Design a protein around this ligand. Structure first.
Ligand SMILES: CC(C)CN(C[C@@H](O)[C@H](Cc1ccccc1)NC(=O)O[C@H]1CCOC1)S(=O)(=O)c1ccc(N)cc1
Lengths: 99, 99
């Protein structure tokens, strides 16, 4: 699709069998999702946002559907205002910015 | 242009007579620029994301050139670690997400 930006670019994602809402976020390198159970091990990651740096859980090679497109990659889990899909997964679904 | 998301979507902007580098950010409601002086009245605002909140000054009816395109709108100014062009100005230059 072509998504205009008059409203928040919210899409439906599917991860761990659960449907959630997430924001398509070109301003984030990484993908951050609110607390949930994911399979396998995690490793520590520090990420920086507008308020500063926080610690999150990094799960690699997670299967996640994003607006109907399958991606498999790194998902960070931690305290976020909204689930955010970052460039690591936007590139997998073939997303570009155009004007 | 069509901007790939392999790297950060950074562009050159001109605001208040100054050239700056800024992130094209679909995940941001508003535009927020590292602290600088702007003309006219302002009011305080709190904005929050990863790492919590920061206090900023809200200036309305500010003209910015974004990669050569003039747009006008609200600009927030404060201690952001990165210059952010948010949806309120991305819409004005006709920016869309496509996949
Ligand atoms: C958290 C989202 C929902 C909203 N933000 C935009 C996001 O793109 C934000 C932009 C940014 C990048 C680097 C440093 C600081 C900020 N990226 C971000 O945090 O990257 C983290 C998460 C994964 O990778 C690292 S915001 O800055 O908090 C914000 C809030 C309100 C307004 N009016 C404007 C901006």
């Amino acid at each position: 699709p072509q998504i205009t930006l008059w409203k928040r670019p919210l899409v439906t994602i599917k991860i761990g069998g659960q449907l959630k809402e997430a924001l398509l976020n070109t301003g984030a390198d990484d993908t951050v999702i609110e607390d949930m159970s994911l399979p396998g091990r995690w490793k520590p990651k520090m990420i920086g946002g507008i308020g500063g740096f926080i610690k999150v859980r990094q799960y690699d090679q997670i299967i996640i559907e994003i607006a109907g497109h399958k991606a498999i990659g790194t998902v960070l889990v931690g305290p976020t205002p909204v689930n955010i899909i970052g460039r690591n997964l936007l590139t997998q679904i073939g997303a570009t910015l155009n004007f």
